[PDB]
Amino acid sequence: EPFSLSPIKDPQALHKELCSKNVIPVTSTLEDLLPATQAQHVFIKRGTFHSYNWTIKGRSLNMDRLRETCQSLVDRHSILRTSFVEHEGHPIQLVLANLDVKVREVQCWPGEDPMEVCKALWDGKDWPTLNVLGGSLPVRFTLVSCPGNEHVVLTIQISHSQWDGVSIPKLFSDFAAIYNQTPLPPTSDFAHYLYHRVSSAREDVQQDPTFQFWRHYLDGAKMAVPFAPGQTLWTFKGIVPPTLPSGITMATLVKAATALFLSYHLGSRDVVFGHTVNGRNLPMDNIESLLGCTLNFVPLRVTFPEDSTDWTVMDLLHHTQTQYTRALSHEHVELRDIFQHSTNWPAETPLSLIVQHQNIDLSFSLPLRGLDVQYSKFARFDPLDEVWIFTEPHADRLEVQVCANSRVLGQEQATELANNISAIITKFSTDPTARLLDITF
Ligand SMILES: [Cl-]
């Protein structure tokens, strides 16, 4: 029920106070006001900002319905109508209604490439002036036309606190839908997800199944704490896709490689690092389809036996995977809650390393009809104190991607990390029965 989780005492006072400052349309009505998730704050603090671009060539294109769809798409999904301000220190998200979407449009000189115009607006003003926490609505649309409207670029701009890998194909789905004027099953929105989390919590916080699970799961764990800390480095390594042992997910293989690597350099038989879970394992409907950012970043814990036990790669793989699936029904809570209620660590403890495998959709489609549609994007992402390892399963390649600021992880160290991890994954694939101690890297 609307406003039941607002930290602000009079929400709509804050609303028109923004309307007055010309931040948000004065025609807009304040629907709800909830706090932002820790994961949301994570992305906003890192300037995670996206422009999904579609190059539409063909004789059909209805520019006016293209414009309609943008209004409609935004009407459907409350999160696309969300504005972020930070009053007191942690962010709140204000949801908007009665809000009509205006599209930025560009008619190019003859011969002027539309994508280049987009790139220019992007680097020129779009992202260098970005100030999501200021309240300006982050979702916004651009339409760049060749002289005759038969070569056009459509770009959606969005903050990662508003989408995830699970639901972003749904944004392109529901968009291509509305243009083709095709039925859509009603959807939930992201605020309803937040509500649904609060209810399935408990009266007593240490009576909660979930904060009881985490306390049991992290009993005796120690997190390694990096040393003293520039620019953002992306370091890549591609390999042959691993041949998975039966029962073993690709993300399991990846997360176990990381554990092995950490155990070796940390000289520890018990390691804890962060990984990304999709956060959609709640008993609610449309949770498969509702648009928003349900991703969470939670401890993955991997514990190795004493050397006498003489474990193999397969032991490690099976252990590592249940150390993930054990958490499925508990993976939706705030990280700070897990640390506050279930551990002795400061509630504001960061994850220093986050492994994120996307067994999600790497390819995107915007199927519009009477039309050649290409996909492409621009993206900003700028890590703080932490190191990211992203893995993507392509046809030709599994791609390991390390992302960290160079003040944290220099190119040589970033290169070695990507290489070493990739090599471990390959060895795991090769002889899944190898003794762990016969492993070199
Ligand atoms: Cl990202």
Side-chain angles (χ1 to χ4, degrees):
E1 261 68 357
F3 295 110
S4 46
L5 296 176
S6 163
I8 311 298
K9 268 63 183 178
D10 170 352
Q12 339 198 36
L14 193 74
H15 171 262
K16 306 164 188 47
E17 146 178 2
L18 281 158
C19 296
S20 71
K21 297 179 67 58
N22 270 30
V23 182
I24 47 184
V26 82
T27 305
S28 70
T29 82
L30 180 67
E31 189 159 325
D32 218 332
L33 197 160
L34 319 92
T37 66
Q38 182 162 19
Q40 282 176 301
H41 206 184
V42 162
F43 282 118
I44 294 165
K45 270 220 210 68
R46 272 140 198 83
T48 328
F49 196 60
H50 267 105
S51 173
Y52 297 101
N53 314 323
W54 302 99
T55 293
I56 328 186
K57 312 192 194 183
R59 298 293 177 190
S60 170
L61 203 42
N62 183 328
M63 301 292 291
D64 212 304
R65 201 180 24 249
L66 219 43
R67 264 164 238 127
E68 305 181 9
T69 312
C70 297
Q71 180 73 41
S72 297
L73 176 53
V74 169
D75 283 322
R76 182 163 158 78
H77 298 287
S78 95
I79 192 57
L80 308 186
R81 287 143 34 202
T82 302
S83 171
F84 300 89
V85 310
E86 213 189 35
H87 185 295
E88 285 136 346
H90 290 83
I92 58 186
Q93 48 186 322
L94 284 65
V95 201
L96 301 191
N98 292 287
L99 173 144
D100 274 37
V101 193
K102 303 301 181 181
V103 175
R104 172 169 86 177
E105 298 190 45
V106 169
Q107 295 81 82
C108 298
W109 291 311
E112 169 172 62
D113 186 279
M115 190 54 88
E116 303 178 8
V117 169
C118 293
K119 193 45 159 42
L121 301 164
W122 184 246
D123 295 331
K125 49 179 305 293
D126 293 342
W127 73 256
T129 61
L130 180 83
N131 184 25
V132 163
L133 267 182
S136 161
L137 293 171
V139 183
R140 34 186 35 193
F141 297 83
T142 297
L143 199 59
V144 176
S145 330
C146 276
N149 289 318
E150 312 185 311
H151 182 237
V152 162
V153 182
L154 154 79
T155 81
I156 301 90
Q157 273 178 25
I158 184 168
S159 144
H160 209 321
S161 63
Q162 294 177 311
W163 62 281
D164 52 38
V166 178
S167 61
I168 198 71
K170 221 101 191 190
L171 178 142
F172 300 154
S173 145
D174 288 10
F175 178 89
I178 300 165
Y179 174 78
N180 298 306
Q181 326 185 51
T182 284
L184 278 178
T187 190
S188 202
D189 54 20
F190 180 72
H192 275 215
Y193 171 94
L194 279 182
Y195 283 137
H196 255 269
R197 290 203 317 185
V198 167
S199 54
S200 83
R202 301 224 170 149
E203 325 196 10
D204 194 326
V205 69
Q206 151 45 62
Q207 217 283 337
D208 210 313
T210 288
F211 298 102
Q212 255 169 350
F213 161 86
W214 283 111
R215 203 192 263 92
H216 178 39
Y217 175 100
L218 295 166
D219 188 15
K222 283 173 76 74
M223 208 141 54
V225 178
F227 214 60
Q231 75 188 318
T232 290
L233 298 179
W234 283 87
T235 320
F236 297 93
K237 188 75 171 64
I239 67 179
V240 203
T243 326
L244 300 177
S246 65
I248 307 307
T249 67
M250 180 68 69
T252 283
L253 214 67
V254 174
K255 282 162 184 174
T258 300
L260 185 54
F261 172 94
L262 289 175
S263 71
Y264 173 69
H265 290 275
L266 294 171
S268 146
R269 242 174 231 109
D270 201 326
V271 299
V272 181
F273 52 101
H275 71 143
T276 300
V277 295
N278 49 39
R280 270 142 145 93
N281 295 23
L282 282 179
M284 99 174 66
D285 38 334
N286 296 291
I287 189 66
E288 41 285 38
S289 63
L290 73 92
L291 191 75
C293 176
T294 57
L295 301 176
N296 200 1
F297 309 116
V298 294
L300 188 61
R301 185 196 193 179
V302 173
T303 55
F304 296 86
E306 215 57 36
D307 298 33
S308 74
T309 279
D310 193 4
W311 256 11
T312 68
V313 165
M314 196 65 73
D315 296 316
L316 180 64
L317 299 186
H318 274 312
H319 172 53
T320 284
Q321 189 165 288
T322 78
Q323 285 298 105
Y324 156 64
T325 62
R326 280 175 74 200
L328 286 179
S329 297
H330 308 278
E331 72 179 22
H332 51 254
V333 289
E334 304 273 88
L335 178 62
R336 48 170 44 96
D337 286 342
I338 296 176
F339 292 164
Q340 168 77 20
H341 302 326
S342 306
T343 80
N344 285 348
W345 308 340
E348 280 321 290
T349 296
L351 300 170
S352 75
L353 171 73
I354 307 150
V355 193
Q356 190 185 110
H357 176 75
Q358 317 104 330
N359 39 29
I360 69 181
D361 260 12
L362 302 188
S363 174
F364 297 113
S365 200
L366 197 71
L368 312 176
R369 217 197 108 223
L371 293 175
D372 169 48
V373 181
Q374 303 311 88
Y375 168 88
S376 70
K377 66 170 157 73
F378 311 142
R380 311 300 300 178
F381 177 75
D382 296 281
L384 306 187
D385 271 339
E386 76 290 342
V387 166
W388 295 79
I389 298 171
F390 299 103
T391 54
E392 280 169 10
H394 295 124
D396 327 277
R397 301 127 25 218
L398 183 57
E399 200 164 45
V400 177
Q401 302 159 326
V402 178
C403 186
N405 182 289
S406 36
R407 301 206 313 248
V408 174
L409 187 68
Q411 180 66 295
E412 335 179 14
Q413 292 176 317
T415 284
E416 201 199 31
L417 180 51
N419 289 340
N420 284 22
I421 296 292
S422 69
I424 299 178
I425 301 176
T426 291
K427 295 206 198 310
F428 284 179
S429 175
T430 292
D431 189 14
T433 75
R435 275 167 50 161
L436 270 195
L437 301 117
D438 289 334
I439 297 301
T440 54
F441 57 99

